[PDB]
Design a protein around this ligand. Structure first.
Ligand SMILES: [Cu+2]
Ligand SMILES: [Cu+2]
Ligand SMILES: [Cu+2]
Ligand SMILES: [Cu+2]
Length: 153
């Protein structure tokens, strides 16, 4: 019902949860209260790193006791990753640089998924990205993770 999450700053966050909430949902509640992006969060319990797709009830937690988790910040670094959403619900992770062309992005999607660049439309903030341009030609806030949507023609 009520659980506690320790942070490196010595602060302790109280959250309201239920056994059927996913770990991802726990990370989302931490984002609501503290503004920390879930992709940065590592939740630790009894030396185990909790998995996003699982529920608290998937873990063997004794409900008599109050549950205390430890939050560690992983990195949003060691390269520049971006994310491309597909119609089949999958999400492709790619490694890119600002000076990569949109066409090069489509080429990387071809290497990973086998989809010809001819057929790819890349969408960002309601804009179709142009093949001859670079990511840096667009005004992308690099402090945020970049998410594109892929549609076929
Ligand atoms: Cu504690
Ligand atoms: Cu490159
Ligand atoms: Cu290729
Ligand atoms: Cu997204």
């Amino acid at each position: 019902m009520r659980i506690w999450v320790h942070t490196l700053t010595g602060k302790t966050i109280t959250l309201e949860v239920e056994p059927s909430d996913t770990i991802e949902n726990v990370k989302a509640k931490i984002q609501d209260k503290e503004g920390i992006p879930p992709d940065q969060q590592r939740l630790i319990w009894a030396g185990k790193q909790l998995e996003d797709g699982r529920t608290l009830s998937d873990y063997n937690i004794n409900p008599k006791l109050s549950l205390h988790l430890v939050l560690r910040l992983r990195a949003a670094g060691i390269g520049m990753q971006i994310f491309v959403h597909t119609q089949t619900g999958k999400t492709i992770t790619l490694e890119v640089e600002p000076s990569d062309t949109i066409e090069n992005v489509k080429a990387k999607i071809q290497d990973k998924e086998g989809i010809p660049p001819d057929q790819q439309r890349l969408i960002w903030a309601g804009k179709q990205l142009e093949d001859g341009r670079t990511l840096s030609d667009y005004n992308i806030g690099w402090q945020a993770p970049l998410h594109l949507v892929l549609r076929l023609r």
